[PDB]
Every structure is written in structure tokens, then in C-alpha cells.
Design an enzyme around this catalytic site. Sequence first.
Site, PDB file in Angstrom:
ATOM      1  N   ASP A   1       0.799  -1.217   0.000  1.00 58.22           N
ATOM      2  CA  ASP A   1       0.000   0.000   0.000  1.00 58.22           C
ATOM      3  C   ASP A   1       0.835   1.272   0.000  1.00 58.22           C
ATOM      4  O   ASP A   1       0.271   2.361  -0.122  1.00 58.22           O
ATOM      5  CB  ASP A   1      -0.936   0.018   1.213  1.00 58.22           C
ATOM      6  CG  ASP A   1      -1.863  -1.176   1.250  1.00 58.22           C
ATOM      7  OD1 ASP A   1      -1.792  -2.012   0.329  1.00 58.22           O
ATOM      8  OD2 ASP A   1      -2.664  -1.281   2.199  1.00 58.22           O
TER       9      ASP A   1
ATOM     10  N   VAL B   1       5.040   7.685  -0.109  1.00 56.58           N
ATOM     11  CA  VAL B   1       3.592   7.834  -0.133  1.00 56.58           C
ATOM     12  C   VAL B   1       2.974   6.855   0.857  1.00 56.58           C
ATOM     13  O   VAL B   1       3.619   5.911   1.317  1.00 56.58           O
ATOM     14  CB  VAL B   1       3.017   7.611  -1.551  1.00 56.58           C
ATOM     15  CG1 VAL B   1       2.866   6.129  -1.839  1.00 56.58           C
ATOM     16  CG2 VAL B   1       1.697   8.350  -1.726  1.00 56.58           C
ATOM     17  N   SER B   2       1.711   7.102   1.192  1.00 55.81           N
ATOM     18  CA  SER B   2       0.958   6.225   2.083  1.00 55.81           C
ATOM     19  C   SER B   2      -0.503   6.289   1.665  1.00 55.81           C
ATOM     20  O   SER B   2      -1.159   7.313   1.866  1.00 55.81           O
ATOM     21  CB  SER B   2       1.130   6.642   3.539  1.00 55.81           C
ATOM     22  OG  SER B   2       0.349   5.828   4.392  1.00 55.81           O
ATOM     23  N   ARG B   3      -1.011   5.198   1.093  1.00 55.95           N
ATOM     24  CA  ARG B   3      -2.367   5.187   0.554  1.00 55.95           C
ATOM     25  C   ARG B   3      -3.404   4.965   1.647  1.00 55.95           C
ATOM     26  O   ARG B   3      -4.233   4.058   1.548  1.00 55.95           O
ATOM     27  CB  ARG B   3      -2.512   4.111  -0.523  1.00 55.95           C
ATOM     28  CG  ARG B   3      -1.605   4.297  -1.727  1.00 55.95           C
ATOM     29  CD  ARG B   3      -1.812   3.187  -2.746  1.00 55.95           C
ATOM     30  NE  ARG B   3      -0.756   3.162  -3.750  1.00 55.95           N
ATOM     31  CZ  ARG B   3      -0.732   2.341  -4.792  1.00 55.95           C
ATOM     32  NH1 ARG B   3      -1.704   1.472  -5.010  1.00 55.95           N
ATOM     33  NH2 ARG B   3       0.294   2.395  -5.636  1.00 55.95           N
TER      34      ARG B   3
END
Lengths: 275, 480, 467, 91
Positions: A249, A273-275
Site C-alpha cells: 500500500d 507515499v501512504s495510501r
Amino acid sequence: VGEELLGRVVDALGNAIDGKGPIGSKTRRRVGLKAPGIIPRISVREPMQTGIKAVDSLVPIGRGQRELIIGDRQTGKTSIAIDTIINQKRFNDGTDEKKKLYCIYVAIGQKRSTVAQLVKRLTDADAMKYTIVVSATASDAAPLQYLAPYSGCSMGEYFRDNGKHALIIYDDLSKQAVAYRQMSLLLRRPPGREAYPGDVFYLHSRLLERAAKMNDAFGGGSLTALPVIETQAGDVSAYIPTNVISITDGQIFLETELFYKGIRPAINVGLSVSR
Amino acid sequence: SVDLEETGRVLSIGDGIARVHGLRNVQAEEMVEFSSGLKGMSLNLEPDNVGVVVFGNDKLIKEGDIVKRTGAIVDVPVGEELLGRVVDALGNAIDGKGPIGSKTRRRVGLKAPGIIPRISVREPMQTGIKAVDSLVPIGRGQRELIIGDRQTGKTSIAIDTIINQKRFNDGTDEKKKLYCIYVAIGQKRSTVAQLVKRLTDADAMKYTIVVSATASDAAPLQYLAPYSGCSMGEYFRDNGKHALIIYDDLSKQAVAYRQMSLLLRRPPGREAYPGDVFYLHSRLLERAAKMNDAFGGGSLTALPVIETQAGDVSAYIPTNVISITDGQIFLETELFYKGIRPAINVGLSVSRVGSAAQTRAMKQVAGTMKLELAQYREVAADAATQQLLSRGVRLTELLKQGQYAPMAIEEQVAVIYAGVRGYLDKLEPSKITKFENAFLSHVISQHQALLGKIRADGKISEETDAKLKEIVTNFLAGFE
Amino acid sequence: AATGRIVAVIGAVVDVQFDEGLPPILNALEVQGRETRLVLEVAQHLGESTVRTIAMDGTEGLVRGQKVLDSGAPIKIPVGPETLGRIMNVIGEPIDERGPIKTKQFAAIHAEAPEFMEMSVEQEILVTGIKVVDLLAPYAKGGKIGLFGGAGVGKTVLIMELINNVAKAHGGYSVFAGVGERTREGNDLYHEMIESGVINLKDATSKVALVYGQMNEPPGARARVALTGLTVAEYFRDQEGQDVLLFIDNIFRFTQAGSEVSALLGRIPSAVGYQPTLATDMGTMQERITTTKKGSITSVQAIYVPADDLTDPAPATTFAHLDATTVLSRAIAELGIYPAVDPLDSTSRIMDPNIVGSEHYDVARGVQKILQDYKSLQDIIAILGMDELSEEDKLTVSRARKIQRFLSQPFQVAEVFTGHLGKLVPLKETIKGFQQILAGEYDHLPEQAFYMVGPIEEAVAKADKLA
Amino acid sequence: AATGRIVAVIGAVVDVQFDEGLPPILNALEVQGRETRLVLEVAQHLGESTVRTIAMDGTEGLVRGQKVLDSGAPIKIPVGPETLGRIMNVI
Ligand SMILES: Nc1ncnc2c1ncn2[C@@H]1O[C@H](COP(=O)(O)OP(=O)(O)OP(=O)(O)O)[C@@H](O)[C@H]1O
Ligand SMILES: Nc1ncnc2c1ncn2[C@@H]1O[C@H](COP(=O)(O)OP(=O)(O)OP(=O)(O)O)[C@@H](O)[C@H]1O
Ligand SMILES: Nc1ncnc2c1ncn2[C@@H]1O[C@H](COP(=O)(O)OP(=O)(O)O)[C@@H](O)[C@H]1O
Ligand SMILES: [Mg+2]
Ligand SMILES: [Mg+2]
Ligand SMILES: [Mg+2]
């Protein structure tokens, strides 16, 4: 499986190698099982705190998620997990059981002295009382290094089904694929790209799908994962890394040029990033 | 009504390898003879058949032919009757002068000597080229590499080196004579013929042996050639004599070995080369050594040659060979085009052992030249800087030679002395060559005694220094 | 014990058939009817009472039907306190023409690695007298050290300098193992060790043992020498309480020699032609060179990189078995800086404030930051030129170019062909000299004064002469 | 001049088996029963009195069993002063 394994160091098949004594356990569990489907799950809603300023403020992580740590050699990947493990003491030394977290560490392909120094570092901060260490060092046979991660995931799944939360870390997933390739070639199976087997994607896809957040009908437990990958000369478009990038993720990137410019930890905030 | 202990029948022929049924008492690596006159080598002993490598064309072998044993491991004729003869890779004469009257034979594949029988290099090996004998000296018992691109001047160095030895070989002292061996791999026949004519004209075919395996020859013949010459060279080393061997091109041997390997269906690697290429040259270049007194005192010197593409020295074979030899000489193409000949890059060329074996006079006159050349290189990219450039250009002009004309050591010493003392800082850079030529002619034709003194003593004495100064200043004043 | 018959000979691989008494794996066998001893080692059990072996010597002259005899145990070599000052080979036979070696006991080559509960976790520092190593990536006691470099860049000169600086003052013993190298260098080492006094031929005061197998041997031998050195290294650690120094030259040849026989054994190649079992057999060998609760071992190993490539499978799996790394570069050697150590690619495990102190760590991090900054301006300088930079960039360029020169040093073992004199710097002088340059106290000196000198005081005098 | 039979046709490679005798390598063979010439050149001796050849023209309509002939020597061509001003193909 069970909670009598807390504070012990065991091999890939559940045998003590720390010299304490036999493990008194009452339950056993298979290593190859299926992940939960669609009905028994629910959304991710709770925080997982690490103690790193650059992570808790720009790349937050929830409970039930998968996050990738990727970089070159000598960049600082291990110390992030070591710091994350230590931070949980202030919650486990408390009253309510809805904010406690257990930890599991798995070492694949490393030498023994590094694991000894890691265990000594853990035991001088009063953190071994809630951790399990599973090791398959560089002198062991290939099947043990191939089997080690599932044997630790199966130990993590025990807490998930009884309303508790747990954390697992697979150190150097890149060194499981070389053991799988060695084991498959000696069985006279045809090679593929870079002589890897034809289904290296399915080796990790069935592994990283077992972390989930359960709803109230099943207890409310959770399980979190943090794999590790190493790249050659900062090449992120290779064969193995691209497979595992498309499964998780999110990812955290580490670089050498930022490491030598005084930026430590060397987190690239423009790409993480971090969804 | 046939025996199968010393006779066989061909079952299949193709891709170089011939499979034979029978021969139940054959030995590993034993010479076998066919029914058409060709000869082969046993390689693979299997429960059902034997694999044989043919040393020739394969249109002369048919299924059903009879193969017989000889009873010996591959060996070649060795001796001193080979001097002045052109032979093939197996020892058959191809010059049409009659048979070779050899009396001794030696195996092609033998291990090199060990730690105890060896000693350090002490004796000098004279070439005749000023740049080599002044900046990259060579000793007896050393391996030096000649690397460069195509059409740069690699063969001429060897050809000049061979001619020079006539001075010592025609003398009386038997501890200064050197024999020579030349091996040709993958060349064109016309070049070899012209080379031997050139050698004959200068009376140098009286102490030389030539082995030839040209382009039209089969691969195994171009793969066996160097070891055959190495054994003939090793003959002298163990009998208290000195020798020299020159491998023309190891790259073509590597190519031939790669061709042989692939037809045997072995796993390829980098650049489709097999993984045993390193051992193939490691065995060969370890058989040159300097024996100690208890073992006789002989020597064997080797000079391999390798070609590169667009000056890429970070390739597989060039890097492999560098990790074996004891020094290298670099030839560039830009210097060759602009005019500097021989085109040697002083910055990269190096020798690890030759420095110890060097005449005192040459050392005395060479050290200063080396330092000054370094300074000129560093400033090339006030009065002192102009002085450095002015010295450097003339020093560069001095180190140029023609072709097929070796020089003696004393003449080089005098010529370099003239430059290093700064006596030639007035002549225009275009007049250095004429002055060098005229000065050398005058010295040779008028004194000869100071030259004899320098040669015998081995050192430049103070009195000799004063006399040299007198001669040089007088001639320079009269140069006009 | 039992007799067999040779059935097939291909290169360095021989197959034997036993009527009864099939030998187990890793046992040694003897060939009957030869002038010189020839030993075989069992590797596989094929079936139908047949085995596949590997030879330790040349196999020319063998005939199908010849007899082979069984021994009953693995290869055994003489080990003890009487191996000091002698020279052995792969199977423990003396090659120094001085008679047999009379020891009391023997030992087998193959053993198992120390267990998990025998490890030690102490860390200290070792001083070498070389500025780059002490300032940037310091060594340690009882650790593993590796030296990476291409061909012709200078690994063995550094190994001999380390021998000269450390080995002489050591109180314990030492072992030197040479694998796949030049013979003349071994002869030089033997003669200079005789001259120095480490080897004494008339008494029992030697402090080094030598094991050799060079590049003129068949691949079977070169795949087994390092274990022969390891055994004699381990005896002095276990049976006696001693500190041991182990030097291995080009451990890369241990891996290459193993891939020359993999094809003949009937396996599928994996990548770039290497054998499928490349990491496991390296891990088996490396785990034995450690420090336990009975003694200490300090290792210095030289490693080779094919075609100046650091991503090749062979040198890319050795990084995980080291505690300190030193990488050599050809581009630096072209500019004339010796030793050609890359300062942005060398690491050590004990570079932290709580071991080496705060001041040392701050100086090292400052010099590394300055070196990194200058590398990012190369593209602009290479085209537009120096005039486009502002003042601060010119100042950083000048300081980085001054710092680069001061990292070079003259070695004592190279005095013969360089015309200089060797130097040896203490740690405090290096720390202070780099602090002074970082503070800008020497901005009025030419950059050519910091070239090939020792302590900082020699720079001002050479600058004063070069007015 | 012995006669053989075709036993395999795979693209432009043909195998022929001989009852007695065997043509040496680099020899030319003639195939019988076609409207135009079709020569084959020997390359290997597989074994069991069988050889592997290559074809100098199109290979279609051949049957497993057609007879072949051995010329006895490699390809021969006219040479002389009457070849000036003419055009000829490979054979
Ligand atoms: N925040 C930090 N401050 C200072 N030093 C740090 C920091 N993080 C990491 N380091 C240092 O960086 C070095 C490498 O760290 P680490 O062991 O985590 O690397 P790695 O990515 O796991 O490497 P490898 O591929 O060797 O396993 C160590 O010397 C460690 O002390
Ligand atoms: N000192 C010299 N003066 C004049 N011409 C020279 C000199 N050295 C070499 N040459 C010329 O250079 C050419 C190449 O000579 P040579 O055969 O030695 O080169 P090479 O690089 O070994 O060639 P190849 O790669 O074709 O074998 C010849 O025409 C030769 O006359
Ligand atoms: N410290 C040094 N000072 C001067 N020259 C050096 C130094 N180190 C290496 N060299 C050069 O390298 C050559 C030796 O290389 P070597 O040490 O044999 O490389 P490798 O160890 O890779 O085989 C010498 O001829 C010398 O010119
Ligand atoms: Mg790590
Ligand atoms: Mg040439
Ligand atoms: Mg070396």
C-alpha cells in the site's frame, strides 16, 4: 503456536536455540493457509505510532496495513524497525488492553553475530518480554530459509483471531527468492527470467495478503506487515522490486546522497507515499 | 576377427568430435592415429565409447575407419637441431629442407616449478629501443605485456628485439647469449614469409625457431601451438641456458578455444566465453622463471601480445591477462597518427622487477630524465614554466627511433647525457634529430675508446664525465 | 577397507563402482599404481553402486578398470605447535624440503560452525597508521575486513603494508593463506620473512605458518586450500588461548574454481554462468571464521571484481559477511592519489559517537559532507566553466580540492620504486590536521603543498620552500 | 555410384540412408524424379549409414522413399575461355 513463545529465540521449525529449555505449548497450526475473504473485513481506522518525526507527520501508518522499506545497502533500513519495536514499551506498560501491540522479528540470510548484537540491544532496553525472534541464518539449508517467513506469519495469526493486535517484520525478502531459485533448479524445473522460477510473484502475493483488519463479529484483531527490499545501485526498475512495489500500500525511499549530506534518517519525502 | 583392446571403429564424425567404439586399454590424453595419416587426442573416456579431438580437417575421416593406439601422451620433438627451421604445431618441417634430426621428446603439458627452485631476477635483457631500455627496463625471467589497438607497431618491437641479440650471440662469452622463439597464431602466410626473409637478411635465422598456425588451419592446431613452443623453450632453461619466447596473439587462441567449447555444448558465460579461459593462460605464463644455482641457473622470458577495441582496457581478456603478468607497455594510436614513433604512453607503462636489473650508468642518466618528463607533463595543460616546457619538448624529440635499427647501450647513455645536461637548449626543436645523428656518427668514428671504457667499467667515472663534456661542447661549437 | 573400479574419466571428475561397502560422502580415496599420491573425494551417490568424485591432482594416464581403495575418514592434516615456520599444501605435505612434520595429533578439514550461544559482542578499535582508514572507516579487534578492487589498483601492496605495520608488534601467532596467486610473490615473502626474523631456522621462535596453492594447480585443489588454512587457524583458538591473525589473498578464486566443475557434475547454470549453489557454500565456509568465548580471530581478506563491476554475483554477496569495507577505484588511481580509496563508498560498524567520541565523529561527518557537495557541481563546471559560480561555490571547490590531496600518503614498502620515505601518522594529528583545514586556517597556501606528506607540519614547510 | 532413400524432410534439411558405401563429407548428391535439378551437400555422418545434408533449391513435394544418387565428387563447374560474357548460377 501460542503465547508461551514470548521472550524466546527459536529456529524455523519452532525449536529453542537460546539454551533456556523446552517450550510448553498446547496448539499447532499449518504454515500454508488462506487469507480472509471479503465479508470478514472492515476499514482501517486506528493509528500505529513509531516515534520517527519524519514518519508520523508525513507518512502515517494504520493498523492492518502493509508498508515497504526499500533502499540500497548501508542506508539505515534495520534501525527503523528496531526503533519501532522499542517505542511500544510505553503502551504495554499500562492498563487497557486495547492499545497494546506484540512484535515478531524474522531474520533471513544474515550471519549469527549480527542477530546476537540485535538481541543484546533489545534486552538492554527491556523489550524482549513481548517479542519473538525467528532466525534462519546463512549457514542453514535452503528449505529452512524458504520456509521461515510463513512459519512466522502463522505465529502472528494466532493473536489476530483472538481480539489482539500484532506486528511482523520480514528482513531482506530478497534473500528468500535466491533460496527458492536454488531449491527449484535442483528439482529439474525449467528456469525463467534470470533463472528465477516461473511464479516468483505468487511466492510473495499469497504471503502479503494475510494481514487484515477484522470486524466485530470475528473479534476485532489486526496484523501489520513491514517487508524490506534491497536494490543494486539505486535501480528501482529491476525484476524483483517491481513485483513487490505493486502489492503493498505504500513505500519509504532511502538514498545515499541524502545520507552523506547530513540528512539522517535519509527519507525522501518527495516520493514516499501512504495510501 | 578383430581385437577391441588396441583398435577401434568410428561410429560418428561431425562437429570436430569423433566417437570411436573399442580401444579398451587407451589412456587419458593419449595420441591416437587414424587410417588417413591424421592424429588425434583422447579426451572423454566413457563406459561405451571414447571421444577424440581431430588435429586437422574433418573431410578425411569417414565412418568405419580404423583407429590405433600409439602408447604415449602428447609430446613434441625438442633439441638444438631445430635452430634455423620453420615447423608446424606438431613438429613437422614445412620449409622443404629435409627432416629434423631430433633425439629427445618432451610432453606439451607439464606443471611449472615451485617456490623452492626459484630465485630473483638479476640479469638485464637488452632490447635496443631507448624508451624501453631507459624508462621500462626488463630482466631475464620476467613476463611483460604489449597491449594496443590494431596497426600501432606491436610486432616491430619484437622484430627489433630479436635482431639486437646478434651482438652477444656472435661473441665468446657463453653467459650472455640468448636464443629466440617466435610463435604465430591466426596470421596470414605472406606476412610470415616476409618476416622470415627480413630475419634472414640480417643473419638472425641462425639462433631462431618459428612455429606457425595460420588462419586457414583448424582450431585445435591454433589451440595447441603455444604449449609446443613453450616446451622447446623449456629445454634450454633446465640445461643452464637462456631463451626468449614471443606469443603473437593470445586473443585468437581464446577465440579458437571458445569455438571448440561451444560445439561441445558447454554453458556459456560473459561474452559467450567459457569459464575456464583464465586457467588456459594461467598455466602457460607460469612456466617462465629464473632457476637458482643448485638447479643450473637458466632462464626463460616471455612477451605476450594482446589487441584491444577502441582502447578498452576494462574488458574480460585484457583484465584477465593483466592480473598474470609483471608489467605492461601501452601503445596509443593518437601518438602514432601525430608522428611520435614508437608511440609509448610513459604515464601508464610500468615494470615491477626490471628496475633492479639495470646498468649503473643508464640509471644515473635516466632518473633525471624521468623526473623532468613528469614535470613537463604536469605543466603542459613565468620563466620557470617556460623552462619546463622548453626542456620537455626536446626530451620528447630525443626519444624517437626509426625501424630495424637497434642501438648499443653506451650510445644511448651518451645521447641521453647530452640532453639531460641541458647542452641542447639552444638548437631549434626541428634540428635535434640531425644533431643526434651527426654526433653519434662523429663519436663512433673518432673515439671508440671512451665507449669501450664505459662498456667495460659499467659506470660513468668523473674523468669520463669531464671527457664527455669536452667532446660535447667541442662538437656543439663546431655544429654550425 | 574396500576396492572399486574406475568407470569414467572426464576432466577432473571420476566415477567409481563398488562391489560392496559403499563409502559415505566426503571420504577420501586412494588410487593404486602411481608414482605420486593421488586422492579423490566423494561428492554424490548416483545409484546402482556408483559414486561421483573430484580429484585433487592431475588425471593424465588413468585407464578404465584401475583399482581404487577406501580410507574411511575425511582428509586429515597435521596440526599443532610444530607447524610454525613450515610450508604445507592442500593435503598437508611439506614442500619446504626440510623433512617430515612431527606433530602429536591430526584434524579433519570439514567441520561445523560455532553455535549461537558461543558468540561475543565486544567492540574496540585498531590503529593502522593510515589516515583514510582511521578517519573515515576504522577497523576493530576480532572482526572481519574486506578489500575490494579491480586489477592493477593495489590490493596486495596494502596487505603487505598492513602486515608490516600490525603483524610485527603482535604478541600472538599469525597464519597466511595464498589461493590462486603468483608463485614468485610467495618466494619473495618467504625470503623476506627469513630476513626479518619472524621465521627462524635454528630454533623454535617462529610466529607464522604458510599454506599455498597457486594458479598453476587444477581446479580441484584451488577449491579446498582455504579450509586447510582455516583448520590450522582454529586449532590455535580452541585448544590454546591465543589471538590469531588470518590473511587470505583473493578469496574470489574459491568461488570461480567451483563453477569450473559445476557443469561436469550435471547441473543447470543459474546466472552469468555461475552454479546454482553459490550463496550456501560461501556461507558454509565464512561462518567458521569468527570470534567465540574461547579466543579471537582477526581476518583481512582481499577480493576481486571482474571487469570493474560491483554488481557481479560473486562480490555482491560478500558484503553481508563483513564488519568493515574498503573500496578501491581506478579513476582515483589515474589522478595519482595513492592509496586509491573511495571516501564516499567505505563504511565501518563502529562509527558512532558512543565508541569513537564526539569530536572524531563530527570531523568525519563534516569532511564527508564537503566531499559530497563538490561532486554535484561537476556537470556545470565541465561545460560552462568556473566563472559562472558565485563566491561560496568557488570557496567550497577550493576547500574540497585541498582536502582531496591531503588523503594521500607514502608507504614504506613502496620506497624502492618511488624515491620517497615512509611515514606513519598518529590519530590525534590526523584529527587536528583535518579540523584545521575545515576551519579555513590554510586558505593562503597553494593546493599542491598537501600532496604526499605526513603530518600537517610538513605542508607548511614544503609550501615555504615552494615560494 | 550407390543409391539411397530419403527418410526425413524438415524445412531445408534432408536425411538419406545408404545400404552400402557412404559418401564423404562435402560431396554432392542428385535427387531422381523431378522436372529440374536438385543437388544436396553432405554435412555430417549421424550414424547407422545415415547422413544429413542441406538443399540448394526448393524442397516441396518430396516423399519419404525417393531414390538418390551419388556423383562421387563435390560440385563441378565449367572453367575456360568460353565463360566470358555469360551468366551462370551456383551449380
Ligand atoms: N539516524 C541515524 N543517525 C546516525 N547513524 C545512523 C542513523 N541511522 C542509521 N545510522 C547508521 O547507518 C549505518 C547503517 O545502518 P543499518 O544497519 O540500519 O543499515 P542497513 O540498511 O540495514 O544495511 P545492510 O544492508 O548492511 O543490512 C549504521 O552504522 C548505523 O549506525
Ligand atoms: N618506428 C617506426 N617508424 C616508422 N614506421 C613504423 C615504426 N614502427 C612501426 N611503423 C610502421 O607501422 C606499421 C605497422 O607495423 P606493425 O606491423 O608493427 O604494427 P601492428 O600494430 O603490430 O600491426 P597489426 O595489428 O596489423 O599486426 C608498418 O607500416 C610499419 O612500417
Ligand atoms: N601505494 C602505492 N604507491 C605507488 N604505487 C602503487 C601503490 N599501490 C599500487 N601501486 C601501483 O600498482 C602496482 C601494483 O599493483 P598490485 O598491488 O599488484 O595490484 P593488485 O593488488 O590489484 O594485483 C605497482 O606497479 C604500482 O605502480
Ligand atoms: Mg540490515
Ligand atoms: Mg601486430
Ligand atoms: Mg595482487
